[PDB]
Design a protein around this ligand. Structure first.
Ligand SMILES: [Zn+2]
Ligand SMILES: [Zn+2]
Length: 57
């Protein structure tokens, strides 16, 4: 796998773990305001809605 981005996405909070979103941001494409950090996405949270991957802010 290619070494991903590693920047903080400012003013984005992970709805999974309430942490910062560092690296890729996974924004749900169905929910109006739902995001996962790559750690929570990796854990399989919010499975059932397609998310969009934003590597960088
Ligand atoms: Zn998280
Ligand atoms: Zn959703």
């Amino acid at each position: 796998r290619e070494l991903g981005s590693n920047m903080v996405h400012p003013n984005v909070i992970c709805d999974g773990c309430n942490g910062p979103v560092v690296g890729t941001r996974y924004k749900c494409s169905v929910c109006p305001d739902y995001d996962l950090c790559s750690v929570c996405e990796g854990k399989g949270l919010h499975r059932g809605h397609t998310k969009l991957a934003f590597p960088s802010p």
